[PDB]
Amino acid sequence: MDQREILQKFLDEAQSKKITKEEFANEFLKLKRQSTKYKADKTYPTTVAEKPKNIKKNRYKDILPYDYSRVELSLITDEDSSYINANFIKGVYGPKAYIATQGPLSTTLLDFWRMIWEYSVLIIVMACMEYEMGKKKCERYWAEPGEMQLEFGPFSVSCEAEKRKSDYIIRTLKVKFNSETRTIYQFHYKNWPDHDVPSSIDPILELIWDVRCYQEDDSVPICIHCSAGCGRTGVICAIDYTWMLLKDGIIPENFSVFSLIREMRTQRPSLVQTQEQYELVYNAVLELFKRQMDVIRDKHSA
């Protein structure tokens, strides 16, 4: 089939059978069942995360990077200095399109910047507040205007500019290491789509649009984090991945949101964590299919 026919079949199916809350809950339960089975089968061990020297580097004891996809550090390497709570996530064309990580701890701030530097990351997407429900969710790894340089071991971080949009801030950060200076763009998203408001997905799509304005391609990983680096991080990953498929005309004939999320959850645990998050991905993906069909319809007018 061609892309138009694949997209139209997804749209026709969505239109002709609306997915109910019970259906979403049943779907998410199968995803959780797969995780139970994989845990019992020892498919994806987390041995490195579990080492005593690495326990204090994990924000949440239940969220440990699978060994096979963990991001290994080597920049200025102590014997466990290789460990960070982060996993590579494959993009549409190959591995390591994304790094999905936790919000750094006071003890992992240096490790965070080592990762960013070592992997030549340009873009950081933060999808949490510093404080949520009154608890601290992420330590300050960024600089703000007027603060000059913050220092994290040998990394000096300053902020040249902030662009304040409706629901997020784009910080232009300058990072210095060993007399080299790099520009990093941090997108700090400080809202989240509301389950009870269909139009509330628009800002998340706008966030990802802007991100892809700054890096269109997959030459270096994009770092995405929230507090745990699962939940909101997975939503963003999944929507972006799908939009890349759409934009490049490579949606597979077997495309499903269920298979997409299945695939993600095998690369970092709980990468999309809740039924509500699963639903947001579905709704966002459907909107993106509609938008790509419009692109096709206008190109076909020639």
Author numbering: 1 to 77, 79 to 303
Article passage:
Here we report the crystal structures of 22 PTP domains, including two tandem-domain RPTP structures and a detailed structural comparison of this protein family.
The atypically open state is associated in STEP with a stabilizing 310 helix C-terminal to the WPD loop (Eswaran et al., 2006) and in LYP and GLEPP1 an extra turn of helix α3 following the WPD loop. The presence of an atypically open state, catalytically nonactive conformation, in three PTPs from different subgroups suggests that this conformation may have significance for the family as a whole. Structural comparisons identified an atypically open WPD loop conformation in LYP, GLEPP1, and STEP (Eswaran et al., 2006), suggesting a regulatory role in diverse family members. Low crystallographic temperature factors observed in this loop region suggest that the atypically open conformation is stable, and multiple crystal forms ruled out that the WPD loop assumed this conformation as a result of crystal contacts. In the first category are TCPTP, SHP1, SHP2, BDP1, LYP, PEST, PTPBAS, DEP1, MEG2, and GLEPP1, which have a “PTP1B-like” accessible pocket that harbors a basic residue corresponding to Arg24 of PTP1B. The hypothesis that SHP1 and LYP have the potential to interact with phosphoproteins containing adjacent phosphotyrosines is consistent with reports that Zap-70 is a substrate of these PTPs (Pao et al., 2007).
